Amino acid sequence: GSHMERLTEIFRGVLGHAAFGIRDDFFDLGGDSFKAIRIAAKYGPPLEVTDIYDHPTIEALAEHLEHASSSSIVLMAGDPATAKAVVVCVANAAGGPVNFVDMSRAMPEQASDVAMFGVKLPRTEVDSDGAMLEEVRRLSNAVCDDLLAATDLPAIVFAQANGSALALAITRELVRRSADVRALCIGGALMRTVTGKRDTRTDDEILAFLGKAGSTLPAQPDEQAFFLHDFRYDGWLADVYYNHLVDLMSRGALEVVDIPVWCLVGSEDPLVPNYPVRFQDWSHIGRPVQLVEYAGIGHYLLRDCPEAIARAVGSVWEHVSC
């Protein structure tokens, strides 16, 4: 029915109880990350997960929906009118712009000149690896189109682990169009040099992997279902694109871009513990390659030191300012 009526129905279904009003905070009574994703998915397209964080009440959220407006990116910090550069952020598997919330909230104090856009992951249904590669091309072109229509500022591409895959695509597209790309920043990932295997693991094996990486899996089976759908989809997409790039390398046909690459890694990351020798493999994509090492931190830099990641993005911009 109405905006607030659908919001109240979805909130009562997702939170557990019906004793809920339109002025109560979403987080002060059990709301979170997964529940916000589930809410944004059930409500429909025009609601984004970040709008629940900027508007954790049903009335304010419905007002936002009134003057709301489809884009492939979402503005998270700064304003392109006053800014000197923009940063396009791609999240890890099962993620999205939400992953950068904290980081965005640190940008005004760590990179005041830089605006932040987050890439939305539609997860379009496809029936083949070739269709998946066509979808990677379509999505990278959509992100580039929306970015070049949103701003004409120098652009930095930031990637979170698995998101690196899509990030690479975007960067390369932006070079084909001779757009103003000045840096590729990648967190908690390494360039893939060998053809990869497809993810045939069980849900429990994924839970163990995420425990090893330092993350817990949600308990609600619907939240788990959405998380695992997105996780396996993103893994498939990234595997396809990295295998394409590795084939290009095998034949010597991967062009090196004159764009610097920053590799931000936590020192205690159990997923890339061989980085001291492998981080330099980003030379296949761009040069020079710079390493920033965060001591005592694991894989999830955006969870454990988001302010420092904003600081790294500001540093990258000032390094490529002139």
CATH of the domain at 48: 1.10.1200.10
Beta pairing class for 114-119 and 73-77: antiparallel
Residues ending a continuous segment of the chain before a break (C–N > 2.5 Å):
69
Last residue of a domain, one of 12, 38, 66: 66
The technique is: X-ray
- Indicate whether 37 and 125 sit together in one domain: no
Handedness of CA 76, 260, 308, 82 (dihedral sign): negative
Output the 3-class SS for 120-138.
CCCCCCCCCHHHHHHHHHH
What residue type is 175 in one-letter code? V
- Indicate whether 56 and 79 sit together in one domain: no
Distance CA 116, CA 311 (A): 13
The CB-based long-range contact list for 172-180 (8 Å cut-off, 24+ gap) reads 172/140, 172/257, 173/140, 173/141, 173/144, 174/144, 174/147, 175/257, 175/259, 177/144, 177/148, 179/144, 179/148, 179/155, 180/152, 180/153, 180/154, 180/155
C-alpha radius of gyration, the chain, whole number: 20
Distance CA 186, CA 124 (A): 24
Which of helix, strand or coil describes residue 223?
Answer: helix
Q: In the beta sheet, which residues pair with residue 90?
A: 159
Distance CA 142, CA 73 (A): 9
Which of helix, strand or coil describes residue 15?
Answer: helix
Handedness of CA 277, 283, 286, 287 (dihedral sign): positive
- Indicate whether 13 and 84 sit together in one domain: no
Distance CA 51, CA 82 (A): 23
Handedness of CA 39, 40, 45, 46 (dihedral sign): positive
Last residue of a domain, one of 66, 98, 119: 66
Contact yes or no for 144/116 (Cβ under 8 A): no
- Indicate whether 204 and 241 sit together in one domain: yes
Q: For residue 197, which phi and psi values (nearest 5 degrees)?
A: -90, 155
- Indicate whether 61 and 81 sit together in one domain: no
Distance CA 86, CA 111 (A): 10
Contact yes or no for 11/20 (Cβ under 8 A): yes
What residue type is 128 in one-letter code? S
Q: What secondary structure letter does DSSP report for 295? A: T
Contact yes or no for 90/167 (Cβ under 8 A): yes
Distance CA 122, CA 230 (A): 10
Residue 254: CATH number of its domain: 3.40.50.1820
Q: What secondary structure letter does DSSP report for 256? A: P
Contact yes or no for 38/12 (Cβ under 8 A): no
- Indicate whether 43 and 89 sit together in one domain: no
Q: What secondary structure letter does DSSP report for 280? A: G
Contact yes or no for 89/116 (Cβ under 8 A): yes
Apex CA 93: angle with CA 158 and CA 47, to 5°? 85
What count of residues does the chain have? Answer: 322
Which of helix, strand or coil describes residue 227?
Answer: helix
DSSP string covering 131-185:
HHHHHHHHHHHHHHHHHHHH--S-EEEEEEGGGHHHHHHHHHHHHHTT--EEEEE
Buried b (16+ CB within 10 A) or exposed e, 90-129: bbbbbbbbbbbbbbbebbeebbeebbbbbbbbeeeebeee
**92 marked among binding-site residues:** yes
**Token pair belonging to 162:** 């698995």
- Indicate whether 122 and 155 sit together in one domain: yes
Question: To which H or E segment does residue 27 belong?
Answer: none
- Indicate whether 37 and 95 sit together in one domain: no
Last residue of a domain, one of 41, 66, 91: 66
Q: How far is CA 194 from CA 126, 245, 246, in A?
A: 24, 10, 6
Residue indicated by tokens 């490529």 = 320
- Indicate whether 172 and 135 sit together in one domain: yes
**208 marked among binding-site residues:** no
The CB-based long-range contact list for 219-224 (8 Å cut-off, 24+ gap) reads 220/34, 222/38, 223/34, 223/35, 223/37, 223/38
DSSP string covering 65-128:
HHT----SEEEEES-TTT-SEEEEEE--TT--GGGGHHHHHHHHHH-TTEEEEEE-------SS
Question: To which H or E segment does residue 306 belong?
Answer: helix 306-319
**Token pair belonging to 223:** 């939240």
- Indicate whether 57 and 132 sit together in one domain: no
Residue indicated by tokens 């923009």 = 86
| Domain boundaries, position 62 | 3-66
Distance CA 290, CA 221 (A): 41
What are the start-end ranges of the H helices in 251-305? Answer: 275-278, 301-304
Distance CA 318, CA 321 (A): 5
Phi-psi domain of 245 (left: phi exceeds 0; alpha: psi -120 through 50; beta: other)? alpha
Contact yes or no for 171/157 (Cβ under 8 A): yes
- Count of structural domains, the chain: 2
- Indicate whether 58 and 170 sit together in one domain: no
- Indicate whether 102 and 236 sit together in one domain: yes
**93 marked among binding-site residues:** yes
Residue indicated by tokens 């605006």 = 115
